[PDB]
Design a protein around this ligand. Sequence first.
Ligand SMILES: Nc1ncnc2c1ncn2[C@@H]1O[C@H](COP(=O)(O)OP(=O)(O)OP(=O)(O)O)[C@@H](O)[C@H]1O
Ligand SMILES: Nc1nc2c(ncn2[C@@H]2O[C@H](COP(=O)(O)OP(=O)(O)O)[C@@H](O)[C@H]2O)c(=O)[nH]1
Ligand SMILES: [Mg+2]
Ligand SMILES: [Mg+2]
Ligand SMILES: [Mg+2]
Ligand SMILES: [Mg+2]
Ligand SMILES: [Mg+2]
Ligand SMILES: [Mg+2]
Ligand SMILES: [Mg+2]
Ligand SMILES: [Mg+2]
Lengths: 101, 353, 73, 208
Amino acid sequence: YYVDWKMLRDVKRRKMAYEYADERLRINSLRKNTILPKDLQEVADEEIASLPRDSCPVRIRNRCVMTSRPRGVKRRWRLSRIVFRHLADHGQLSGVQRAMW
Amino acid sequence: RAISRTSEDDPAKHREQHEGQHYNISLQELKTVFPHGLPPRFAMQVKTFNEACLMVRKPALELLHYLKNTNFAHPAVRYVLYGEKGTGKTLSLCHILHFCAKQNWLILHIPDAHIWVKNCRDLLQSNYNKQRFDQPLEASTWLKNFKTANEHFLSQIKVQEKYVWNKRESTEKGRPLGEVVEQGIMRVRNATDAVGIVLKELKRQSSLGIFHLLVAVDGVNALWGRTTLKREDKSPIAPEELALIHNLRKMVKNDWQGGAIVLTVSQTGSLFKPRNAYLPQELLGKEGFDALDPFIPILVSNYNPKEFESCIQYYLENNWLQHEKAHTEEGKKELLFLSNRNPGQLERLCAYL
Amino acid sequence: YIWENSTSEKNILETLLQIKAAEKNLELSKEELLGTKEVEDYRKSVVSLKNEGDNENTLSQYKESVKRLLNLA
Amino acid sequence: SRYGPEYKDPQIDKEYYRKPLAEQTEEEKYERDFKKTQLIKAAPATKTSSVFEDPVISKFTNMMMKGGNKVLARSLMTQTLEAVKRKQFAKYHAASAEEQATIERNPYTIFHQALKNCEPVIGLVPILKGGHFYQVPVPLADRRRRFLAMKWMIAECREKKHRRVLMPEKLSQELLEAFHNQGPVIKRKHDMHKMAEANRALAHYRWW
RNA sequence: UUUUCUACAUAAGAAUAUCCACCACACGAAAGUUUUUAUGAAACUAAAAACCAAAGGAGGAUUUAGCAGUAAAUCAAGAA
Ligand SMILES: Nc1ncnc2c1ncn2[C@@H]1O[C@H](COP(=O)(O)OP(=O)(O)OP(=O)(O)O)[C@@H](O)[C@H]1O
Ligand SMILES: Nc1nc2c(ncn2[C@@H]2O[C@H](COP(=O)(O)OP(=O)(O)O)[C@@H](O)[C@H]2O)c(=O)[nH]1
Ligand SMILES: [Mg+2]
Ligand SMILES: [Mg+2]
Ligand SMILES: [Mg+2]
Ligand SMILES: [Mg+2]
Ligand SMILES: [Mg+2]
Ligand SMILES: [Mg+2]
Ligand SMILES: [Mg+2]
Ligand SMILES: [Mg+2]
């Protein structure tokens, strides 16, 4: 069990994106180039939009891996701001100290 | 104890031992010799002092010596003045200008060529050539200044050509050139074309023995650099598009006889040039330096210790330095250090101490 | 910068023939004028000036070449 | 304040050090200045040992500054002294024999004298008593009077000048006006005296 | 007006709410219309240009901040 239903949805979304990552890249190349005929580009737009909705990189949401907080998450540690302080204040993170200057 | 104004005023007999000496020039003399733009810092100084004085500089003496040996049979000789900002390059040119006026020479003096390049309110397309522009406001002002510079030559010169202004008025051959410039002043639309006609007529007739032609152009680097002025599309125009620059460009290429041109490359009015750059090559660029060889690059320097004392003593004679302690040697040392014995910086300091 | 087939070279030819015509000297040849020692001094000065760049001595060398080429002292 | 209580204000006047042998008490003062090993603050950027500076000019220059443009404020103060000098020089030329040796051509003398005529002699401070405010005159200190004169100069030439007329020339005109005791600043000084004299019976309210 | 524009680091040129026989004009659109670019499956989001030039002419009772490299002015990067 993931910590929340929202976290489970993200795992399905990331998994679907990985499967269709290469196929989307090949089709999206045709659209983003102006040297191909406009007739072919219109057909490509139909095919790229016919792919499943969840297979979109923009729909991927970055959460915390511990508490699944949708925002306030540092990208480096992939942790929420509350959990990061909880680990750092106890000295359980290497090289992290209270800033004084 | 310094000698400031004891030297007798004569541009012809100025010798080397008279270095760092001020010679008086009459106020009415400035009116008939400098109708164009005198430098604003110097023009303000003479108005307050009510006395016009100029110090004999080494570059002025060096250029004076070459002028006395000029051979009018030989083609034109190009002299250029270069140096750092505030060294009195314009006043050195004005010293040459007064000398040639005293010898009754034909004067073509340009106060600042940058004015004809930047900040033009009116941009009228030309008629002689469709792909060229006109600057009536700048051209008309120069003609009025040139008209008052000399009057004897404006009537002595006879125009031998066929010139048509419009379908209603025209000027035929035999008319004095003074009537042509007066037509250009009254008719501002064709004033720019009048400037080209005046320039080309003098150049063609300069080969005769009736002329002692001197052309003074200040800011020659503006004849080849890029121009700020744009067009209806707000696109920059080349410096060759302007008719005034294009015709004046023909006045510096060494092909005519019986004349000499004194040039000066400056930085104060330059466009797209850095503050520190003062040497002739970078100011002119590749194209500017290419169409100017050969020349004599006379260098203008700062004050020497002898000159510095003379300038300070000159102000004390006019009671300009009004500070209580400015009369002591300690004040003189501070002026030397702060101004770096540079004439331009010294004038700014003395204006408020 | 190469001296051969240059715009500065064209100016020198025009500058020298005018003096020769003014002095009424009927000798006119490309080899004669371009083989002069003074022109060789001019060639060295211009090439050095455009390549090395502006300098106090470089301009001083340029002054000497022009003064001797124009018979001005 | 990065300076501790031990640090003191440096002495800049060079003449104070070059001729100490003509006095005894002052010699004891500065010989103990370093014998006590008292630390000295760094020299401020504005003040300098140049003989051409003046303390009243620096204070006036600082107040003219808006934001952080010391260059612009110094530039304006340079032109104003020049502008005053130009006007006095022109007036000297167009004068008779007796009028010639009357006009002052020293802007520093004019500037110092102008401010000494714009300083009020007695100010006003509100005092609350009985639920109402009474304007009670007080003998303003010398520093306040000197500062108040400078503020009036700046306030006048910033507000009621025209948009076309430049700042350096407008301030130059008022300095000459104050030098002759006829400027609007002098009028404002008299107006403060009018109110102080009117409330001359309320001076008993103040308790110092 | 200690202002605006351009060149450029700070010594320059030019403009400047007014005159008018007609004109046309200063400061100030960040807004809005149109076009284009960037991201993205999707532009409704952001940015650039052209056109456009409105309120605003130092703000009522009252009120906030700062003791020195501080206030204020100006520039830059980073987090997501
Ligand atoms: N020969 C001189 N005699 C007296 N005063 C001089 C002389 N030369 C220069 N000055 C003073 O120095 C000022 C600078 O002169 P000028 O404007 O000619 O300088 P410039 O070097 O040509 O400047 P820029 O860099 O603007 O081209 C003059 O206004 C004058 O006050
Ligand atoms: N209005 C007018 N101007 C003329 C006429 N002829 C010559 N000019 C002017 O004289 C100047 C010299 O032109 P020019 O150098 O001979 O032209 P180019 O041969 O193309 O370089 C030009 O700027 C013209 O404006 C004419 O018939 N009418
Ligand atoms: Mg839960
Ligand atoms: Mg798209
Ligand atoms: Mg997202
Ligand atoms: Mg100059
Ligand atoms: Mg300016
Ligand atoms: Mg505007
Ligand atoms: Mg605007
Ligand atoms: Mg907008």
